[PDB]
Amino acid sequence: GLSDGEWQLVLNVWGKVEADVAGHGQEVLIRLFKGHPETLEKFDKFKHLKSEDEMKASEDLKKHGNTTLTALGGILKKKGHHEAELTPLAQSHATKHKIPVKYLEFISEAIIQVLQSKHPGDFGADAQGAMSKALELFRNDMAAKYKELGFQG
Numbered sequence: 001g002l003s004d005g006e007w008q009l010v011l012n013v014w015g016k017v018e019a020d021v022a023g024h025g026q027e028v029l030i031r032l033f034k035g036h037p038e039t040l041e042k043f044d045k046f047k048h049l050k051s052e053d054e055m056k057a058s059e060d061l062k063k064h065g066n067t068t069l070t071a072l073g074g075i076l077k078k079k080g081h082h083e084a085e086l087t088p089l090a091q092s093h094a095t096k097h098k099i100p101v102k103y104l105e106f107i108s109e110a111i112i113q114v115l116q117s118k119h120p121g122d123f124g125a126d127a128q129g130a131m132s133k134a135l136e137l138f139r140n141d142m143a144a145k146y147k148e149l150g151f152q153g
């Protein structure tokens with residue numbers, strides 16, 4: 001959905017995340033939990049973290065962040081011919097974890113805020129715009145799969 005050029009920007013900033021997937025993954029879930037505390041409640045092993053000090057110290061949080069970003073990089077690498085990899089994710093999220101589309105917007109924001117915080121240099125006006133279109137396509141495709149399995153509610 002982006003131009004070839006926009007995908008390139010997207011894969012190029014993602015190259016930075018790939019050099020530290022779990023430290024970027026940890027910081028994204030801390031930003032999401034801190035930003036929207038209600039999301040935390042969706043996680044049984046984190047539901048009890050009461051502060052950012054406890055979130056930073058959690059081994060499990062760091063793992064789950066690695067898991068989350070590893071899965072999103074597999075989707076981003078397919079540029080948009082990503083139906084196959086998105087499916088299973090829409091399936092588990094809609095049906096087993098029961099994650100509203102709204103929360104996919106909250107995590108897209110937490111992603112942009114960590115790339116901006118960790119790579120101010122590299123994540124300039126054009127990289128930010130290309131990653132925001134890429135996360136919006138992701139969330140639109142997830143919403144599409146949700147309304148299909150017949151959720152969104």
Ligand code: HEM
Binds near residue numbers: 039099103
């Ligand atoms: C960038 C968007 C996301 C991606 C790529 C992603 C990826 C994953 C993956 C790969 C798993 C493990 C497999 C599965 O159970 O499907 C998972 C589990 C899970 N996800 Fe997500 N996720 C995303 C967003 C969210 C959001 C926004 C929430 C909640 C606010 C969430 C809640 C959960 C929960 C509750 C589980 C089960 C965790 C566990 O095993 O205890 N996910 N997610």
